[PDB]
Chains A and B, each alone.
Chain A
Amino acid sequence: EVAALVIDNGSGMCKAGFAGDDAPRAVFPSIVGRPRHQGIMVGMGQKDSYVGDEAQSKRGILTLRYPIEHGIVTNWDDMEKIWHHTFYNELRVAPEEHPVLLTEAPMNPKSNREKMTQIMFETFNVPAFYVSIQAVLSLYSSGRTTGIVLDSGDGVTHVVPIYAGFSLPHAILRIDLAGRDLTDYLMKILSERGYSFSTTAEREIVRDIKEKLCYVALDFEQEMQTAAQSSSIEKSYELPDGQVITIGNERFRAPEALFHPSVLGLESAGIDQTTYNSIMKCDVDVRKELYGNIVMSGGTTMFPGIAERMQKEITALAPSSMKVKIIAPPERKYSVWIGGSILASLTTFQQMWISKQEYDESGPSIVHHKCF
């Protein structure tokens, strides 16, 4: 029939597409831009709002805003503009014609979940709706019903233990350090090497250096000095201006903040310790399966060496007899979205949607149990 629409609203990037597709058709920055002074002509800022890539490219004349902070919607007017844009300009379909599956961050407040439900039914007039926890979709994507998902995105990093299909809320832990923080951190240490990056285009360069040259060191200490005595770890980066530069140890120093947030004046356990902490809050019978199914999702887990470093660190914290296994799907930047695409395409899911009729009779508060 009519494909369901699947949208994963990341703090940094929105992934949108049609259920049944193997990947999101549209992946764009979760930004809403508005003219500081709107015009009456082409190229002057005639539209009352811009979303995504366009808002980004028209930086010079717009005021950009991010309605999602740490995976939580904090500006509903702006969120609705992103959603409107997503349906009509990105997917190019009217929402009233399709079931819509949205994702949410672990531990998303109940008021937010109901507001989202209300907007979808009352504003976009969707015929069917469902909301899924991001980490759970990633777990399904990996072909499992049990595991502990480490989802490090742009805005937040969550550790979510899931047993037999159900997350264990009491054990979910959040680390308030993610990709945005890493880019800013690389921007600082690169700056202290004698280079300059402070504007958004410059920051975008640093983000590019982060996603292309950075890596997680297996043993930080020994790695450091291996850059001290050699130029074995140095790679050259060709700037947009032609000028070429050399990134050295900043390559592994930046992502190291994931293991030691202290480097950002942040007093929080790193991702390895937090994964152990979460597993420890779970029932014994479940821990063995969690240790054996540590699933990585999110762009910030894309750093080469991260799985090898997590395997080592977790092995050291777990009992010696414990089989520890780290699963890092190559497609983990889209794991959440793919999980949603699969879920919404299942013949068996067709009775799971909250209907318009149901919403009409019981309202938005039905979302919590309906999407449990």
Chain B
Amino acid sequence: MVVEHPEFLKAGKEPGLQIWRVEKFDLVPVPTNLYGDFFTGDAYVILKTVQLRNGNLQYDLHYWLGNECSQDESGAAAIFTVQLDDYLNGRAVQHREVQGFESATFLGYFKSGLKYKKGGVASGF
């Protein structure tokens, strides 16, 4: 909330899906054309925004943890999730999504399913 970050300003403004990858202690947007591709050595934050009938926005925040992501990436994905929820006035529901155990809800956001990729950005440690 006293948080000033360009992606926080873009977060959950219009209905849709937004995805960011944790890259060395920062929250970096994933190009829209690559939504669905997930590096197994990385951690990501997914925000699904839905327009409610009364005009309010309902949020579901999913932090996806790759099987080989480092502690700084999973730790930051979790913290970024709490921060975004706080920034969006706490209107979101937080979901922890572990590679191999993703919820049906999360998977449903990807019509063509998920594309796991070995590797990822190096730890920020």
Residues of A whose CB lies within 8 Å of any CB of B are: 20-22, 139-146, 164-165, 331, 338-339, 341-343, 345-348, 351-352
Query: Which residue in chain A gives the minimum CB-CB distance to B28?
Result: A347
Task: Supply 30 A–B pairs (Cβ within 8 Å), ascending by A.
Answer: A20-B124, A20-B125, A139-B78, A140-B75, A141-B75, A142-B74, A142-B75, A143-B71, A143-B74, A143-B77, A145-B63, A145-B94, A165-B94, A331-B71, A339-B75, A341-B72, A342-B71, A342-B75, A342-B79, A345-B25, A345-B124, A346-B25, A346-B76, A347-B5, A347-B27, A348-B5, A348-B27, A348-B83, A351-B2, A352-B3
- List residues 1-17 of chain B with CB under 8 A from any CB of chain A: 2-5, 8
Q: Does the CB pair A342–B85 fall under 8 Å?
A: no
Interface residues of B (CB under 8 A from A): 2-5, 8, 25-27, 43, 63, 65, 71-72, 74-83, 85-86, 94, 96, 123-125
- Identify the closest chain A residue to B26 (Cβ): A347
Contact with B8, one of A145, A345, A348 (Cβ below 8 angstroms): A348
Tell me the complex Cα distance, A20–B76, Å.
12
CB distance from B112 to the nearest CB of A (A): 27
Most buried by A among B77, B124, B125: B125
For B72, the chain A residues whose CB sits under 8 A away are 22, 341-342, 345
Apart from the given pairs A143-B77, A343-B75, 11 other A-B contacts in the complex at a CB distance below 8 Å: A140-B78, A140-B79, A143-B43, A143-B71, A143-B78, A143-B96, A164-B85, A342-B72, A342-B76, A346-B26, A348-B83
**Docked complex Cα distance between A21 and B123 (Å):** 11
Distance of B106 from chain A, by nearest CB (Å): 16
Residues of B within 8 A of A345 (CB): 25, 72, 124
A141, A145, A351 pick with most chain B CB within 10 angstroms: A145
- Which chain B residue shows the least CB distance to A164? B94
Specify the chain A residue showing the minimal Cβ separation from B6: A347
A166 to B8: give the CA distance in the assembly, Å: 20
Chain B residue with the shortest CB-CB distance to A165: B82
Query: Which residues of the partner chain A approach B94 to less than 8 Å between Cβ atoms?
Result: 145-146, 164-165
CA distance A144 to B97 in the complex (A): 10
Cα-based distance from A212 to B26 in the complex (angstroms): 39
